[PDB]
Amino acid sequence: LSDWWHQSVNVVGSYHTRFGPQIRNDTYLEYEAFAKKDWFDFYGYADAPVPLFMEIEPRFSIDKLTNTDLSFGPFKEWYFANNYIYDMGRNKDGRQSTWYMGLGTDIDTGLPMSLSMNVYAKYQWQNYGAANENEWDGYRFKIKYFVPITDLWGGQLSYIGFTNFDWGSDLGDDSGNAINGIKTRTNNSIASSHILALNYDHWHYSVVARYWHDGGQWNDDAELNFGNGNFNVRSTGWGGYLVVGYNFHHH
Ligand SMILES: Cc1cn([C@H]2C[C@H](O)[C@@H](CO)O2)c(=O)[nH]c1=O
Ligand SMILES: Cc1cn([C@H]2C[C@H](O)[C@@H](CO)O2)c(=O)[nH]c1=O
């Protein structure tokens, strides 16, 4: 319902994406959803081409549920936090099921913005047949913030930023080496997003700048050859997205 549950369908164009071995630029339909109802907040999305990829972020309030004011310092609340990534792929081979679970919170910066932090431990199921499949592998720290800016062109301009820090994975150690002599995969990785979004009653446009450091744990510069000759992995660098979508809600 419009009250708390927010929906939106979007068309996204991406440029120089870095979660895989090779650089990519795609376009696709996306289904987004945000929600906040006393003991549960949520954010998630599903992408589909011109098979299916989705990432959901559900968190449950340890306060509301434990009916105890865990409030302390700038820490307004505490959550059982989750970050689940799923990629259907074309074969059980190009599939991914990742589950980050942990502790998350909301910070009060006294500033006119929203800020959240979450630490997760994760269990890895399918992962494109990589070495870290089916096992507890790595941790992740997620920091995200929302910053209302002003009213620009009749709509409302805002800034959304979030970064995912991953470390302690066992891949990279367990993967092989490249032609390069350097390991192919990586134990850690960073993906930082910066979003400038324009919102009207229903339509919205967003520009997204995104930076990877060893994207998808692919060790930057690793030299590989998938059968078309040697090439070097470009997993560290920028890429971006253009987003046009429509938010639904009765009047
Ligand atoms: C956010 C995210 C996206 N992706 C990639 C897979 C697809 O190339 C694309 C789908 O949005 O994003 C990952 O592999 N892992 C992630 O954690
Ligand atoms: C706003 C937001 C977007 N995204 C995703 C949705 C799109 O696939 C991409 C660019 O908006 O980032 C998140 O992963 N988390 C968020 O909180």
UniProtKB/Swiss-Prot annotation:
Pfam families: Channel_Tsx (PF03502)
Record's subcellular location: Cell outer membrane
An example Gene Ontology CC term for this record: pore complex
Keyword Transmembrane: yes
Membrane topology reported for the UniProt record: Multi-pass membrane protein
Result of knocking out the encoding gene: Loss of susceptibility to contact-dependent growth inhibition by CdiA-STECO31.
Gene3D superfamilies the record matches: Nucleoside-specific channel-forming protein, Tsx-like (2.40.230.20)
Database matches in InterPro entries: Channel_Tsx (IPR003055), Channel_Tsx-like (IPR018013), Channel_Tsx-like_sf (IPR036777)
Primary location recorded for the protein, binned into one broad class: membrane
Family membership noted in the UniProt record: Belongs to the nucleoside-specific channel-forming outer membrane porin (Tsx) (TC 1.B.10) family.
UniProt-recorded name of the protein: Nucleoside-specific channel-forming protein Tsx
Protein's organism: Escherichia coli (strain K12)
